[PDB]
Design a binder for these strands. Structure first.
Ligand code: MG
Ligand code: MG
Ligand code: MG
Ligand code: MG
Ligand code: MG
Ligand code: MG
Ligand code: MG
Ligand code: MG
Ligand code: MG
Ligand code: MG
Ligand code: MG
Ligand code: MG
Ligand code: MG
Ligand code: MG
Ligand code: MG
Ligand code: MG
Ligand code: MG
Ligand code: MG
Ligand code: MG
Ligand code: MG
Ligand code: MG
Ligand code: MG
Ligand code: MG
Ligand code: MG
Ligand code: MG
Ligand code: MG
Ligand code: MG
Ligand code: MG
Ligand code: MG
Ligand code: MG
Ligand code: MG
Ligand code: MG
Ligand code: MG
Ligand code: MG
Ligand code: MG
Ligand code: MG
Ligand code: MG
Lengths: 71, 155, 115
RNA sequence: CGGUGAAAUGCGCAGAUACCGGGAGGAACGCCGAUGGCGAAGGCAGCCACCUGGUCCACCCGUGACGCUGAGGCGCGAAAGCGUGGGGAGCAAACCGGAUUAGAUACCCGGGUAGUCCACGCCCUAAACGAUGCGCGCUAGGUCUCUGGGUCUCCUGGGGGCCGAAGCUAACGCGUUAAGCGCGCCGCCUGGGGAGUACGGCCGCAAGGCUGAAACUCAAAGGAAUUGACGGGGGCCCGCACAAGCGGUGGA
């Protein structure tokens, strides 16, 4: 239990593909859509999120991929 | 040694200087259990050393070992193609032991007619940094960082 | 001839060989070096030591073009990718950043039989 | 540079590789992604909108036995493969060249045509597998999971898994997702090899497919489980077995 992104957030719309400030938090240091293990999301939730992020990337708002910066 | 680690033999201290290193060396000189002849070849070689340098042979001795002690060596490993010559650092004891052996082995090479001298000279030369005692140290140390390209197949 | 203050150090390590090119802050290469340029033949180029060499020579040629600092980009999985970095790190160039940008297809060309 | 155990073929001073920017093209969609979902099967995953099938739950409103199965028929049917046309990045049968090896004529490396991709028409086979036909009723429970409903501690449907009562089984195993207890209906089996061969008939442009023998010959062919042995299988352990040494044999 490193940190669950379900808790660090109030309530939001999972079908909202424009809410970058939320969505941003379900991706990794790379653009990669986090695993349900780190998202804490339901089984149904994760599939919905999944599509919303895809929609939003295609819109230009979220990244397909990043580059890992050795921090 | 498959069950346990073998426990190093504790040697008897030398009969003139007390340094166990003296004895260790002596043993390596002798052959066929001829310990008396050995001591004589040692201690007479000290006399030549005490003669032709003036200082104390014990210490020329205890110095000629540091200058043959190899700081690391090459051992052997086989991976997935054949046998890449691997480098690896050399323990406390193995150094001391390799040294004594090498001193004697190459002391015995020298042209000098008599044993006591041959020891005395190599025990002097090497004590400074020359003579095939060191050149077989400066050899095993050479291949240590000449095949350091293969220094990632370590154990 | 030119004078290059800061720059880029790109490190592309194969399983077979590690190449390092150094460029200007616009990304145009200045001098480069590899494991074979170091003067190795086959299997031996793809080696944490060969790579430590490739990097060192790369920065050697480089600091002669006035090189002072570098941002580092590594592309690839492979031996001495890590060595190439540390070689750069302790070469005399101040290492501003490190990044990995190994290209991961988002599932495109069918690979060769042995993958 | 690439490439392998090592290496060459190949590519490179017509400037390659590595690096930045521009452009074209094809093919497949990383993360989510699951041991998950949907489908009658074959099969189906970037995103969007349109057209469209199956399906589950609640309400218990309408019909009033209208149901189940199904020879033949008809339609669907992975991959490869055929015909015409388009397309061709990557890959890659055959084929070309490098190595390996006693020899490779394969496994490894560098190339490369069909093909892989789209449309249209064929082909119709499979370890097309749960190797388990469909429908219905009956016979402890536990646990994990996808997905509905409720007076949502828990209760109640429909899927997907693991473990198990009774029972069944040659055993392995199955066990409310039955291989248990029963009824209905279809398909199929009847010793091994010969053989999915022959002949005949049907389909097919072809490649070939479906249907399918006997003579002969063997006395077994088989399934599961047991002990052992062996493995260029795994795990732990030991012997001067290797290693670390000292001294020899092999030469005279
Ligand atoms: Mg032990
Ligand atoms: Mg480019
Ligand atoms: Mg083209
Ligand atoms: Mg199903
Ligand atoms: Mg299937
Ligand atoms: Mg009613
Ligand atoms: Mg009525
Ligand atoms: Mg009525
Ligand atoms: Mg029906
Ligand atoms: Mg029917
Ligand atoms: Mg077909
Ligand atoms: Mg096809
Ligand atoms: Mg065709
Ligand atoms: Mg054509
Ligand atoms: Mg050939
Ligand atoms: Mg090939
Ligand atoms: Mg090719
Ligand atoms: Mg009901
Ligand atoms: Mg439920
Ligand atoms: Mg169930
Ligand atoms: Mg069971
Ligand atoms: Mg029982
Ligand atoms: Mg039932
Ligand atoms: Mg039965
Ligand atoms: Mg028969
Ligand atoms: Mg018969
Ligand atoms: Mg048949
Ligand atoms: Mg056939
Ligand atoms: Mg057949
Ligand atoms: Mg026929
Ligand atoms: Mg015909
Ligand atoms: Mg058939
Ligand atoms: Mg059997
Ligand atoms: Mg064994
Ligand atoms: Mg031995
Ligand atoms: Mg011998
Ligand atoms: Mg003899």
């Amino acid at each position: 239990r490193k940190a669950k992104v379900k808790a660090t957030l109030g309530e939001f719309d999972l079908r909202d593909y424009r809410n970058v400030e939320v969505l941003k938090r379900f991706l990794s240091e790379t653009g990669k859509i986090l695993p349900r293990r780190r998202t804490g999301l339901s089984a149904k939730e994760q599939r919905i999120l999944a599509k919303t992020i895809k929609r939003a990337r295609i819109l230009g708002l979220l990244p397909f991929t990043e580059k890992l910066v050795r921090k | 040694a498959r069950r346990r680690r073998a426990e190093v033999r504790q040697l008897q201290p030398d009969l003139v200087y007390g340094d166990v290193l003296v004895t260790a060396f002596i043993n390596k000189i002798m052959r066929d259990g001829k310990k008396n002849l050995a001591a004589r070849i040692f201690y007479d070689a000290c006399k030549i050393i005490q003669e032709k340098t003036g200082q104390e042979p014990l210490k020329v001795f205890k110095q000629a070992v540091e200058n043959v002690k190899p700081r690391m060596e090459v051992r052997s490993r086989r991976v997935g193609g054949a046998n890449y010559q691997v480098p690896m650092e050399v323990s406390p004891r193995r150094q001391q032991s390799l040294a004594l052996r090498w001193l004697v082995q190459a002391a015995n090479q020298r042209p000098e007619r008599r044993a006591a001298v041959r020891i005395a000279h190599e025990l002097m030369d090497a004590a400074e940094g020359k003579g095939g005692a060191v050149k077989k140290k400066e050899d095993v140390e050479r291949m240590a960082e000449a095949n350091r390209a293969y220094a990632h197949y370590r154990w | 001839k030119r004078q290059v203050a800061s720059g880029r150090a790109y490190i592309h390590a194969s399983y077979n060989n590690t190449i390092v090119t150094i460029t200007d802050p616009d990304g145009n290469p200045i001098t480069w070096s590899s494991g074979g340029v170091i003067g190795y033949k086959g299997s031996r180029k793809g080696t944490p030591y060969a790579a430590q060499l490739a990097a060192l020579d790369a920065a050697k040629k480089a600091m002669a073009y006035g090189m002072q600092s570098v941002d580092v980009i590594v592309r690839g999985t492979g031996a001495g990718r890590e060595q190439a970095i540390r070689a750069l790190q302790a070469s005399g160039l101040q290492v501003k950043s490190i990044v990995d940008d190994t290209p991961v297809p988002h599932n495109g060309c069918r690979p060769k039989k042995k993958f």
